[PDB]
Design a binder for these strands. Structure first.
Lengths: 136, 852, 86, 80
RNA sequence: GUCCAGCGUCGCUGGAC
C-alpha cells in the first residue's frame, strides 16, 4: 500500500492510489541485486521525501524488523528474475500491443464504477456494488 | 593487458605512455586495408566529442611505415590551410613527387649510375609535364578553340586508351608509375577536418570521386557527417533554374523539390563513404564495460611512484576512490553515477584529471580541495562557457550560492535541480555539474554554520522561488518577463552579498507571506502570523502576544524567532527559518566570552523588511514608512558558552556532501507543507492548552515546525553521510512527525539500541544530530506549555521521548516539577509560557471541537 | 565577426529555400557551435586576462578597496590633500 | 606598458601594430616581415664585428627572396 | 477596556486614557 501512494500539492494536498506506481516500484526494485538495502529503499523512495506541484497549463512488533519477511520474499523473488529474464526477447510491437490493451482496459473500468458506490458498498459481494478495493 | 603509469619519468601531459587506448582498433583497421588492396576504398573515421582523431590517424600512418605489403603513406593535408584558389589535386601531386624525388635522389647512394636510374628519372619528368598541359582545363571559365587541337593531338606512348585530354586517366598513369618506382602496392592519402573552414569540403568531395578512383589508391577521411550532409544539400539547389524557383512556388512544388533534393544527397553519401567501411572510436566506458561485467579488455592504473604492476588497480576503481573521497560520498548507487558519466569523457582528457589528482595527493604526505583543483585545469572551457564563476581565487560562500542559482536557471529544473546531478543534454552543463558538486563539499567541510548557510541560501532560495515567485510570470509565455523577474529576485534576496543568515530569513518571510491562502488564515509554509493589536472579543484565554511575559531564556528564544514585515499594515511573524538564521550566525563566532555577549545581543533585535518589488503594495509600504534583561541574560550566555565549547571539538570531522544537504532540504521542505496544511483547520474555540490531538493552537504549530527540522536532520544523515559506512535506521517505513511525536521518538529508540551493540557513541556516527539536539536556543520550543498532548495513550510516548532526549544531550533539561505542570504560580525559565494563548490573524473562533 | 564569416559558407540558394522554423533552428545551432570551437582553439581560456573596472578597484560603499585612487581638482591643490575618487 | 616592461631568457618586442591604421589591401604577413627586417638589418649594420655579417647576411637575404617568390599566393583572385 | 483616526476588500494597523 505504501508503494501505491502519491501526494500532489495544489492549494490542498491530495492523495491518490495509482496503479502506475506499482509498475514503478517493480521496475525500481528489479534494477539490481548488488545490495540488500536497495529493495527497502524502493518502498520509501518517494512516499514522504518529495512534493509535486500542479502543472503550469492547469486552468487553476519491534518496529525495526517489520519488513524482515517482505524483504525476504522479495529477495528470493529476485533469484528467479535473474535467471528467467535472460531468455526474454521483447519486440517493438509486443510493447506497443500490451499498452493498447492495458490502456483500453483501464478506461473501461473507471467508467463502470463511478456509479456503483452507493451507501452499503462495504463488504462488496454483488457485482452491482463496488468500493475502493474492487476498483484497485 | 594494459598498464598506465601516472608517474612517467618526464611527467608528460595526458600521460600517453604506451599502447595508447585503441591498440585493438588500430590493428583491426590496418588489417582491413591490406585485405582490400590485395574501386572504392574510402574509409571514414568519425572523430567527435572532441576526440583525438588526428592522434589516432597518425598512429595508423606510422604503423603502415613498417608493413609486409609496404603500402606507403603520404603526409596529412589539412584542407583549411591550403591556399584558397589552389585545387586539392595539387597537394597530392606535390606530396607524391616530393616523396618520390627523395628516393631517386637516394638511389645515388645505392647506385652512383644505373640504367634504371637514368631512365626512371626522365620517364617521371615526362608524366609531370604531361599533366601540366592538361591542368589548364580545371579553373578555366571559357573554352577557347585552341584546346581542340591538343585533344585531337595523339601520343603514341603512355597508352592513353580513352581519347581526349581526360585528366582522370593522366593522373592514373602517374600514380601507377610512382608505385612501381617506389616498389609499393598502394599510395595512401589522409584528409583532416574541415571544421574551421566549412566550404573546404566540397572541393574535396568532388575530388575523391573524380581523380582518386583507382585500384592502387586508398584514402582515409575524418570529420563529421552533419557538415557534409549540409554541404551536399546546398550544392543540389544551385542547379535548379533560378527563374523557375520564383515561378512555380505554389506550395506543392516546394514539397516535390524538397523531397527530391533529400533523395539526391542520400545516394551521394552512400556512394562515397560506404556503411561497411565507416569506423567508430570506442569510448572508455565501452572498453572497460559496466561494473560487474567483464566486457572488453580490462585496464590497470598505477597510483604511486615505483608501484609494482602486480598491484595496479582497475581504472573504474581508480576513479571510484577519487569521487567518493573527493565528494564525501558513500559507496552507494549515486557515486556510481558520477564515475559512469566521467568514464564517457575522452581518454586524453581523463588521464589529465587523474594525473593532477594522484600526484598532488602523494606529495601531500583536504582531499576535496585537491579534486576541485584537478578539474579546474581540465574542464576550464566548460566552466567559462556555462557562465559560472571561473576566477582561480576568490572562492567562498559569496560566489557558490550565485553559481548554484545561475546553473539551475540555465538547466530549467527548479524541482530537483539543486542535487547537482549530471543528467543534462549539454556537455558543458554535464561538465559543470561535477565541478559544482566538488566545490560544495570543500566549502562546508569541518564547520556547522557554513553547512546551515548552504541549506538555507543555496537550496532554500531555489525551492522558494519555484513555488511562489514563478507562478507570477511563467517562462513559456514570454522571456522578457521571466528574465526580468529573475534579476529582481536575486537582488532582493541579496544572493552573493549574503550579509547575514538572519538577513535571508527575514526576506524569505516576506516572499512567502506575499501569496496568501484562499481561506485567509495566518499560517504559512514555515511561519505563523502572530497578531500585533488586541482584537475585539476573545472567547477564551486568547490575548495579545506580549513578549514581555516571557522569562529569561524563553524571551531569548522569542526575540530570536520574531521578525516583522511592512506591507500595508505592520505584520508580525514567527518563522522557523529565523531560528536557523540564529544558529548560523552564532556558530561562526570562534571567539571568547567577551564577543559572545556582543554576538548574542546582535542576534536578538527587531528587524523590519520591505515587500519585494513584484508585489501590489510596494509603493504604499514605502510611503507609510517603517516605524512605530542584560542581568538576566547571563544564564543564557552561560549556556551557549558551554555549547560552543562542544561545537568546536565536534565539528572538526564532519563531511557534508552536495547530496546530503540536498536530501535534507527535500524532507524538511515537504514536512513543513504537511504541518501547515494539517493544522490549518483545527483552531476551534476552546483549543488552548492542547491536551488533545484533535485541537491545535499556535504553540503546537511551532513545536512541530522546529521538530520537523530536527527529524529531517536525523533520517537523511544516517542514510547519507561519509563518516559512517552503514546505516542504523533499520528495515522499516520512514514517515514524518506531522501531528504526533511518536514517529520521531520511534527512530530514536531504534538507533539507540543499535549503537550500544557496536559500542559507538553519537559523536562518531551522528555528529550533526547531536550538535543540533543540544542547542540551547531551541530547547524551549521542543516542550511548550500548550503544545503537549496529555492523553493516557500518548503520554507514555512523550515521557519516553523526554528520557531519550536527556540521555542524548547528557543533562536533565526539565525538572520533575516542571514536567508535572506541563501535563496538568510557577515560573519557567526554559519553557514558553505564553505562546499558546496568542491569537492568529484571519482565524475566526467559531464552532467547537468535534463531538465524541 | 566570426559568425558573419560562417553564414557565408552556406549555399545562398539553400538559405532562401528551406525557410522553415524547424530548419532555422537546426542551422542556428550548427553556427553558434562552430564559432565557439574557433575561439576556444585560437585564444585559449587559461590565457585570457580581463581588465578591472572602477567599481572593482574602489569598492562598494564602505567595503575595503583593492587599490587606492585619488584625484586632484585644482592646479593649486597639494598631493597630500587629494580626495578619493568616490 | 606591458611592452615597455618587457623591453627594459631574452624576448625582443616587436613594435605594436594596429590593423585599422594600415593600407586596406596590405596583408598582415607583409607588415610583420617588414618590421622584422628593420631590426635584423639594424643589428647587422651596428654589429660590425669580424665577417659574421657576410655569411649571416647572405642566409637572411636568401630567405627574404624565397618569401617574395611565394607571396603571389596571398594576393591571387584565381589560380595561374 | 473605551474612544478617535488610517490601510486593504469585514479584516488589519496606529494613537489616546
Amino acid at each position: 500500500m505504501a508503494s501505491s501512494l502519491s501526494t500532489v500539492a495544489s492549494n490542498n494536498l491530495m492523495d491518490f492510489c495509482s496503479v502506475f506506481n506499482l509498475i514503478g516500484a517493480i521496475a525500481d526494485i528489479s534494477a539490481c541485486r548488488c545490495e540488500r538495502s536497495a529493495i527497502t529503499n524502493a518502498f520509501n523512495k518517494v512516499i514522504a521525501q518529495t512534493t509535486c506541484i500542479v502543472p503550469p497549463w492547469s486552468e487553476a512488533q519491534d518496529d525495526a524488523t517489520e519488513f524482515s519477511d517482505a524483504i525476504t520474499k522479495v529477495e528470493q523473488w529476485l533469484k528467479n528474475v535473474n535467471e528467467i529474464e535472460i531468455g526474454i526477447r521483447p519486440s517493438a510491437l509486443l510493447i506497443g500491443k500490451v499498452w493498447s490493451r492495458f490502456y483500453f482496459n483501464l478506461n473501461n473500468v473507471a467508467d463502470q464504477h463511478k456509479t456503483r458506490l452507493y451507501r452499503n458498498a462495504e463488504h462488496g459481494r454483488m457485482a452491482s456494488q463496488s468500493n475502493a478495493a474492487k476498483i484497485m | 593487458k594494459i598498464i598506465i603509469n601516472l608517474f612517467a619519468p618526464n611527467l608528460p601531459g595526458s600521460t600517453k605512455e604506451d599502447d595508447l587506448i585503441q591498440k585493438s582498433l588500430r590493428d583491426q583497421l590496418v588489417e582491413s586495408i591490406r585485405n582490400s588492396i590485395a574501386g572504392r576504398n574510402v574509409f571514414f573515421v568519425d572523430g567527435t566529442r572532441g576526440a583525438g582523431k588526428t592522434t589516432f590517424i597518425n598512429s595508423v600512418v606510422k604503423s603502415l611505415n613498417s608493413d609486409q605489403d609496404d603500402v606507403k603513406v603520404n603526409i596529412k593535408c589539412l584542407p583549411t590551410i591550403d591556399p584558397t584558389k589552389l585545387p586539392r589535386h595539387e597537394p597530392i601531386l606535390v606530396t607524391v613527387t616530393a616523396r618520390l624525388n627523395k628516393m631517386v635522389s637516394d638511389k645515388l647512394k645505392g647506385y652512383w649510375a644505373s640504367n634504371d636510374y637514368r631512365k626512371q628519372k626522365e620517364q617521371w619528368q615526362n608524366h609531370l609535364a604531361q599533366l601540366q598541359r592538361g591542368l589548364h582545363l580545371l579553373t578555366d571559365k571559357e573554352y577557347k578553340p585552341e584546346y581542340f587541337s591538343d585533344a585531337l593531338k595523339l601520343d603514341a606512348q603512355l597508352d592513353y586508351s580513352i581519347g581526349g585530354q581526360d585528366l582522370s586517366e593522366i593522373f592514373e598513369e602517374l600514380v601507377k608509375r610512382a608505385c612501381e618506382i617506389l616498389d609499393c602496392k598502394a599510395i595512401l592519402i589522409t584528409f583532416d577536418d574541415i571544421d574551421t573552414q566549412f566550404d573546404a569540403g566540397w572541393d574535396v568531395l568532388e575530388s575523391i570521386r573524380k581523380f582518386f578512383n583507382s585500384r592502387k589508391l586508398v584514402v582515409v577521411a575524418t570529420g563529421d557527417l552533419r557538415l557534409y550532409s549540409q554541404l551536399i544539400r546546398g550544392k543540389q539547389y544551385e542547379n535548379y533554374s533560378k527563374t523557375l524557383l520564383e515561378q512555380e512556388k505554389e506550395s506543392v512544388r516546394l514539397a516535390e523539390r524538397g523531397y527530391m533534393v533529400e533523395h539526391l544527397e542520400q545516394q551521394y553519401l552512400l556512394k562515397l563513404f560506404p556503411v561497411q567501411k565507416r569506423i567508430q572510436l570506442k569510448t572508455m566506458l565501452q572498453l572497460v564495460g559496466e561494473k560487474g561485467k567483464a566486457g572488453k579488455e580490462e585496464i590497470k592504473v598505477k597510483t604511486e611512484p615505483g608501484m609494482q604492476d602486480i598491484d595496479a588497480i582497475d581504472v573504474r576503481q581508480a576513479i571510484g576512490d577519487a569521487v567518493r573521497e573527493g565528494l564525501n560520498l558513500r559507496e552507494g548507487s549515486d557515486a556510481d553515477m558520477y564515475v559512469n558519466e566521467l568514464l564517457k569523457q575522452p581518454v586524453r582528457l581523463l588521464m589529465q584529471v587523474l594525473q593532477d589528482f594522484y600526484t598532488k595527493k602523494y606529495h601531500a604526505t583536504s582531499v576535496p580541495n585537491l579534486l576541485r583543483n584537478a578539474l579546474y585545469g581540465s574542464m576550464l572551457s566548460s566552466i567559462y562557457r556555462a557562465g559560472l564563476n571561473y576566477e582561480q581565487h576568490r572562492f567562498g560562500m559569496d560566489s557558490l550560492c550565485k553559481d548554484i542559482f545561475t546553473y539551475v536557471k540555465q538547466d530549467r529544473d527548479f524541482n530537483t535541480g539543486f542535487y547537482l546531478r549530471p543528467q543534462s543534454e549539454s556537455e558543458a552543463l554535464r561538465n559543470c555539474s561535477i565541478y559544482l558538486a566538488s566545490q560544495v563539499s570543500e566549502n562546508c567541510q569541518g564547520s556547522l554554520s557554513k553547512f546551515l548557510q548552504m541549506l538555507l541560501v543555496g537550496c532554500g532560495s531555489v525551492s522558494i522561488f519555484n513555488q511562489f515567485v514563478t507562478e507570477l510570470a511563467r517562462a513559456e509565455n514570454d522571456r522578457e518577463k521571466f528574465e526580468q523577474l529573475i534579476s529582481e529576485y536575486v537582488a532582493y534576496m541579496s544572493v552573493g552579498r549574503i550579509e547575514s543568515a538572519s538577513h535571508w530569513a527575514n526576506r524569505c518571510c516576506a516572499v512567502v507571506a506575499n501569496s496568501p491562502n484562499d481561506e485567509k488564515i495566518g499560517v504559512f509554509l514555515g511561519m505563523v502570523q502572530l497578531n500585533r493589536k488586541s482584537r475585539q472579543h476573545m472567547p477564551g484565554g486568547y490575548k495579545k502576544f506580549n513578549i514581555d511575559t516571557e522569562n529569561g531564556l524563553a524571551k531569548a528564544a522569542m526575540a530570536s524567532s520574531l521578525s516583522t514585515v511592512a506591507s500595508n499594515n505592520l505584520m508580525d511573524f514567527c518563522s522557523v527559518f529565523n531560528l536557523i538564521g540564529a544558529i548560523a550566525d552564532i556558530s561562526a563566532c570562534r571567539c571568547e566570552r567577551s564577543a559572545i555577549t556582543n554576538a548574542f545581543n546582535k542576534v536578538i533585535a527587531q528587524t523590519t523588511c520591505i515587500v519585494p518589488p513584484w508585489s501590489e503594495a510596494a509603493v504604499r509600504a514605502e510611503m507609510k514608512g517603517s516605524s512605530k534583561d542584560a542581568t538576566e541574560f547571563s544564564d543564557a550566555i552561560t549556556k551557549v558558552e558551554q555549547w560552543l565549547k562542544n561545537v568546536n571539538e565536534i565539528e572538526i570531522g564532519i563531511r557534508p556532501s552536495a547530496l546530503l544537504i540536498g536530501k535534507v532540504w527535500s524532507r524538511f521542505y515537504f514536512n513543513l507543507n504537511n504541518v501547515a496544511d494539517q493544522h490549518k483547520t483545527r483552531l476551534y474555540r476552546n483549543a488552548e492548552h492542547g491536551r488533545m490531538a484533535s485541537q491545535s493552537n499556535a504553540a503546537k504549530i511551532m513545536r512541530f515546525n522546529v521538530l520537523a527540522f530536527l527529524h529531517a536532520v536525523l533520517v537523511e544523515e544516517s542514510l547519507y553521510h561519509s563518516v559512517s559506512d552503514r546505516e542504523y535506521i533499520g528495515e522499516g517505513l520512514r514517515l514524518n512527525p506531522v501531528t504526533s511525536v511518536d514517529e520521531f521518538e520511534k527512530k530514536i529508540k531504534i538507533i539507540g539500541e543499535k549503537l550500544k551493540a557496536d559500542n559507538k557513541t553519537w559523536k562518531n556516527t551522528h555528529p550533526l544530530f547531536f550538535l543540533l539536539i543540544s542547542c540551547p536556543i531551541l530547547h524551549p520550543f521542543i516542550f511548550p506549555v500548550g503544545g503537549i498532548n496529555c492523553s493516557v495513550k500518548a503520554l507514555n510516548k512523550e515521557t519516553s521521548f523526554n528520557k531519550l532526549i536527556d540521555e542524548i544531550v547528557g543533562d536533565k533539561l526539565l525538572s520533575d516539577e516542571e514536567w508535572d505542570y506541563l501535563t496538568k504560580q510557577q515560573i519557567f525559565q526554559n519553557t514558553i509560557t505564553s505562546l499558546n494563548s496568542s491569537t492568529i490573524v484571519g482565524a475566526s473562533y467559531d464552532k467547537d471541537t468535534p463531538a465524541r
